[PDB]
Amino acid sequence: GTFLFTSESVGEGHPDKICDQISDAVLDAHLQQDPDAKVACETVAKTGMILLAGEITSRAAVDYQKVVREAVKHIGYDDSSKGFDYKTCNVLVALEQQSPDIAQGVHLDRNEEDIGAGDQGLMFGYATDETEECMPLTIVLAHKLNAKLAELRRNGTLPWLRPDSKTQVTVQYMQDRGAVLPIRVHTIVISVQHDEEVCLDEMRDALKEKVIKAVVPAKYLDEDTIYHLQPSGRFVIGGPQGDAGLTGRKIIVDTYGGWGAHGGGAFSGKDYTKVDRSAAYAARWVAKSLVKGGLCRRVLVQVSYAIGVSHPLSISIFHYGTSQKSERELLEIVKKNFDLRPGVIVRDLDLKKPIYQRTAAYGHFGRDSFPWEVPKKLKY
Amino acid sequence: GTFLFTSESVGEGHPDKICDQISDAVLDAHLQQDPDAKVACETVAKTGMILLAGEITSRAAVDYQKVVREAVKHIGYDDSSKGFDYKTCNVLVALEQQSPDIAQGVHLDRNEEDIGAGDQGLMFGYATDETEECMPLTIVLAHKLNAKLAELRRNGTLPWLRPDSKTQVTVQYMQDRGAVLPIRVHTIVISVQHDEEVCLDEMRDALKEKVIKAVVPAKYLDEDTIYHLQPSGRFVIGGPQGDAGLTGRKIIVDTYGGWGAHGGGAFSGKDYTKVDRSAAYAARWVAKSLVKGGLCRRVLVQVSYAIGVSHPLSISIFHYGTSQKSERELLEIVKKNFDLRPGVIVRDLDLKKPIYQRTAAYGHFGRDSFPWEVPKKLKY
Amino acid sequence: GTFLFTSESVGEGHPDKICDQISDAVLDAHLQQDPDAKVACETVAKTGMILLAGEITSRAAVDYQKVVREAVKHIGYDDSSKGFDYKTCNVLVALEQQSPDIAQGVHLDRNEEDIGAGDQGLMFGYATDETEECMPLTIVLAHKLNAKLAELRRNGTLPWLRPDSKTQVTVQYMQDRGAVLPIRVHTIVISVQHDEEVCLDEMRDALKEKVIKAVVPAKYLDEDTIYHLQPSGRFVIGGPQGDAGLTGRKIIVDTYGGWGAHGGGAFSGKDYTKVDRSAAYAARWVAKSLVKGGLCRRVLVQVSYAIGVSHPLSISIFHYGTSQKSERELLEIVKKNFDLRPGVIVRDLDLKKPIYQRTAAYGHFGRDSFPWEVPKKLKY
Amino acid sequence: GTFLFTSESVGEGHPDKICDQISDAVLDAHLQQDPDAKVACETVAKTGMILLAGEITSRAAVDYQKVVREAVKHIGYDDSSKGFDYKTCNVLVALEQQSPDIAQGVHLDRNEEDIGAGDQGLMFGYATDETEECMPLTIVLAHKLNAKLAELRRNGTLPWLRPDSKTQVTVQYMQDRGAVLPIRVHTIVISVQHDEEVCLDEMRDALKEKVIKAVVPAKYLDEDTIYHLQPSGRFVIGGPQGDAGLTGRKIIVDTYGGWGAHGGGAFSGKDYTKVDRSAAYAARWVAKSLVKGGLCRRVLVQVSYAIGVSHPLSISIFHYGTSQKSERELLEIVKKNFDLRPGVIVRDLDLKKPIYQRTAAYGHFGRDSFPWEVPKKLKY
Ligand SMILES: C[S@@+](CC[C@H](N)C(=O)[O-])C[C@H]1O[C@@H](n2cnc3c(N)ncnc32)[C@H](O)[C@@H]1O
Ligand SMILES: C[S@@+](CC[C@H](N)C(=O)[O-])C[C@H]1O[C@@H](n2cnc3c(N)ncnc32)[C@H](O)[C@@H]1O
Ligand SMILES: C[S@@+](CC[C@H](N)C(=O)[O-])C[C@H]1O[C@@H](n2cnc3c(N)ncnc32)[C@H](O)[C@@H]1O
Ligand SMILES: C[S@@+](CC[C@H](N)C(=O)[O-])C[C@H]1O[C@@H](n2cnc3c(N)ncnc32)[C@H](O)[C@@H]1O
Ligand SMILES: [K+]
Ligand SMILES: [K+]
Ligand SMILES: [K+]
Ligand SMILES: [K+]
Ligand SMILES: [K+]
Ligand SMILES: [K+]
Ligand SMILES: [K+]
Ligand SMILES: [K+]
Ligand SMILES: [Mg+2]
Ligand SMILES: [Mg+2]
Ligand SMILES: [Mg+2]
Ligand SMILES: [Mg+2]
Ligand SMILES: [Mg+2]
Ligand SMILES: [Mg+2]
Ligand SMILES: [Mg+2]
Ligand SMILES: [Mg+2]
């Protein structure tokens, strides 16, 4: 009755994640001055280049040079020896206003609570009782491995580390009436950019002893656990020099690591009127509320929207057999307890607050008690 | 016992899909001359701009100006009145060689069958017997609605249409022992870019009568079906002028429309050594082989890889309760019948052939009898 | 005793001149809000692209998209059929603050009158009594031919004209004691971008009859005058699509058409602290004052500066033998009547006023009674 | 009877000169493979960015990444501490084919000797017997000061130097029957980018003792000579980070430093069919031939062209009163001894040879016995 499942995560300096963090730094900069800024900022990164492309209508005055470079500084790309430097890279801006055709169809002259969805689309929320975070263990572990790398880089204990990293965790699970129970870690991959001087065996030893053993409980690790540590053998070239980055190319890392489902919308660089972000956050909030409220052990929530229409087109609940209530009963509970219009979600989840850069690495869910991580007490 | 499920699709001129098609036009151009080209081409589109960013190591001599502009021409952006013109747009190129650190870790000096995966990652394949295409009805219908729009644009019957479109279909389903049975279409959204002269009622009438009724069987449509046709009210500004596009931002449209699962990897712009594409195609091939072979009615396949390692790290089969065989038995059948090393997949699926631009709109699966859509006869 | 001399001019839609006008539109936009803006804006134009690159420190909030596109609109590039369209081109911005090392060395904490030169360099002013404009006839005629083309394009009498044009005029001169006396026009070149439908003979006839004869006095034209009208035979592709443009690549067209001398500094995109512009304008003002004041018939003025130093390093006067006073006496007159510190020039010539876009085609000198064209009454 | 005259030069790492050298590195790369390449390559430089924009029709396969980065390496921008790094900067390419309308009008189906001029324009050549180089002393000295800085940077004796430098020299002259005789150096400016650690007095002392005294004969220097050494006080930020660069923005530095005249055409990035380069080189060759041949002491030559026309429209000779022959007699000598069609100049001056990057700093004239610097023996 056992099965394997694998999830990955990436570090702050992974080129796609650089772009997500920059896009959200831009969003936060606008929101600091104009809580109602309309923001759709994509970022592209390649050798020596950050390009901002998209649509922003805002009363803010934002110094894009400063904002972008400070985000890259935070990540740790501060010298040409590392392959990228915030001080000397190119920052190019191709930002126009929001289309007035979109603006008139979505929000102009509308009461805030009755703003239309900013686009069509579908979104999913998921929660699982297998961890206190209500997240899959596979991705929780994958994120923590990248966070550990960044910690040891920043505190100087592994000064050969660079910011670009990836991890991948395969867990063997059993199932119990639709819920999932982690048994052991089957395989771990870690690849991380490094300096020219450190040798491969020193890196592999450090990744096992100072990273894996520091993060993963020993009860999950055994003689049979497979380790692929620096499996390429050499990773000196990294960041955008090694691989182009784009915003919204880590959408599964941002969410549930292959578990649950995804509707395809990226989060970063978007204000609350973009339901790709606000409704996915709300859907997580619903899912987590159902599990922490004791109605399910595991649950998937779908919602969908049409551009210009406030209420969701569809809502669906899938409980994997882990509730005594029918899925229809859970749907009725959700409909009685949540208002999933974007102009109400914004109020419930405080989505005009400039906290988005903090969401843009290590997953949007399962950490930091953001509003969508604080369960709603349900009435039924 | 009924539930709703929603999927979307986008047209050829949707700015993200423009980028996928350009990236794959670039890939095909390289493969026409050098079957072993290493290609990782991202495309970004905004007002007046196509930017190519990424890594290509190839013996081909490719005229990027010509290749990009011809792809945009095919899509139909051929005049400033439409918001974008292949003849006069900017084409910018930021393409470097593949990192030699990646090359040495993945493919240099390796026997082709034993080439390492081009990256780590996870991938899923899915198949469902609800349609002959072995695809969810929701996304099949969504794709066909966009294809219909392009057909009526190109044949001149709706000359006010422009290339940028989106559709979304919500189907009410029942379930039968883990399989799903479509009952009716609950809601349809269509948004499509249009000329300045046509009025809203003419468009809405045409979208119902010439698009929806031409595509969706009447047995699925009834008095209660909800239509959101041009719901924003005005969509004259479109294509990249209205919304920035990036490669790999329609990964759910490219695959299963929210059904099954996704590991996060984009397809377009990548040669076969990128397992994001080759192994996802293989996983579809496996899933479809299991369903057409009569072992399951519905099945999800996960695989995962480490950079530089040929064999998958993990393989998992989930049959939703729709097989008499256990998931472990199906896994054994898969392991006996498929070799999921990238250097074997390339041979089985003919992945050096320059057919990729054809995959880059209307989904990669469920059409055209591509090799991954021709079931393998299973021995067990 | 006769000789030939040739000068050229270009139209508003010549790609280099597009860039000069855009750079100066940006400067004017800043000056409208912040008279003390520090501006060093270069523009690059190629197919579908305007790129702004440079350094601006200003309290203004400038919408670069709007400013750039409005300048291109004014020029007349408004449709993909013309090769460039303000509505749909790419506008990319790579603008940073002025270097703080420059700012501290030039203007920070300095009394305005005692601001240092913004850079080192040399500059020349020139005037000649051969025309009332105090300009060489060769370039006056060349400019007027381009202005005529733009006039006939804009009033619809030659609707096949596009904005990109070049002209060149060769005049036969005699000399009289260092002054020059035009005798006849020896050769005229006109090349102008055109639509696909008009034939070559219609264009050549129109350029002779409606352009040349409308601009050049018949007394200068005879049986022997050589006409090279549309000499390439076909000029449908034009503007930035045909030829990349850059700011500051028409510095001889901007000034004296090969007569006098040039110190190499471009004018457009620069505020008054850049002595390339302010001191060259002042030098013209000096030269014109000497000729209109009756001291010379023709005169060349050199000045030069060091970055951070207010007073010119050198001043030189060359009168071609056309004064009864020695060059040393004229130099003394200039030193007694003009203060060529940039922080005084700014006051005398009103150089914080946003009139710069008007200078950026058809020459900076010899027209419109700008302040540097109004002679100073000299005391001696 | 004395006067001052000032000329400037810039170093290899001056951002405009970076662009000229890159443009000519691109030209040379094409010519190495295809002697008949048609090349019009502009370069733009700003923080972290080299952009190539222009038109190239060539049979060569050129790796623009490699070519650009190697040119920047040669200049010495190899670390983020210097403000720019060839290894990690962005290289963007916007290169299209030559316009076919230009190609058909200029060179297609034409006998090489009878190729038309690639454009209209005017050009000047100049020579002066005041130095053995036949160049003005002011600019010769200015160039040598920059060359000295680069020498002391590269040999490690002044390791605080960076590549970006400017110099300016003012010489007091007397005249003798139209020729000019240098008397003394009146003022020298040197500004050079430097590291954060060196102090201002150490730099000023080194610039006087190790640079000026090493280059300028002591006979020209006296108690009254004015030195402006690091006059801004601080120049740590430099190269493209401090100031945008463009190709063809140092046209007076490239030529005669304000002496003679200039027709406005840039040299770098252009093949021989662009008469801006080939005819200006030829005009220098003519001028130098007249002076070294003993006909003049100082001479200015003008030539001009029309696009598509092989022979020059006009030729003019101005000898400043320094010949016993009339200017008409010298013109007749020039016409009997030189064929100034571009398709003949190419043969006489060997202009398909890839030696152009070597021309792109320290002036195109007066050094290295390039073909246009080897006087032609005149018959008359
Ligand atoms: C392997 S690259 C993707 C494929 C790549 N675009 C190509 O040209 O083959 C994807 C990511 O893997 C990581 N990476 C880059 N170089 C690597 C190396 N030498 N070894 C292992 N991982 C690497 C970085 O995180 C990078 O963003
Ligand atoms: C709505 S836009 C995305 C949000 C947008 N970036 C913004 O600034 O608000 C996404 C897509 O919707 C479609 N779209 C663009 N303009 C639209 C309009 N006026 N009405 C409906 N759909 C539109 C296009 O397919 C476009 O790529
Ligand atoms: C001839 S182009 C310069 C050379 C060009 N970059 C090349 O690739 O050969 C310079 C200018 O000449 C004009 N021009 C462009 N196409 C032309 C044509 N077909 N005939 C005549 N003049 C043209 C435009 O004003 C353009 O900016
Ligand atoms: C002074 S900058 C030109 C004006 C500048 N674009 C601005 O924003 O004010 C021109 C050149 O002077 C030199 N330069 C740059 N920074 C300097 C400084 N702090 N001191 C002296 N010269 C400098 C470099 O050679 C640079 O290319
Ligand atoms: K989702
Ligand atoms: K990538
Ligand atoms: K997948
Ligand atoms: K977008
Ligand atoms: K000047
Ligand atoms: K050009
Ligand atoms: K010249
Ligand atoms: K500049
Ligand atoms: Mg990626
Ligand atoms: Mg979407
Ligand atoms: Mg998108
Ligand atoms: Mg991936
Ligand atoms: Mg030009
Ligand atoms: Mg200058
Ligand atoms: Mg400059
Ligand atoms: Mg020219």
Side-chain angles (χ1 to χ4, degrees), chain C residues 14-16 45 242-246 249-250, chain D residues 40-42 53-55 270:
Chain C
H14 180 282
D16 288 331
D243 181 41
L246 308 166
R249 283 286 289 269
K250 288 285 162 290
Chain D
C41 193
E42 313 290 13
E55 306 83 35
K270 299 177 179 174

Side-chain angles (χ1 to χ4, degrees), chain D residues 3 109-110 126 146 151 162 245 294-295 337 344 356 359 370:
Chain D
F3 62 94
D109 294 321
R110 283 170 81 162
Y126 180 78
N146 287 302
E151 179 189 358
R162 273 81 169 92
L295 287 165
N337 283 271
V344 180
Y356 293 109
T359 73
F370 294 126

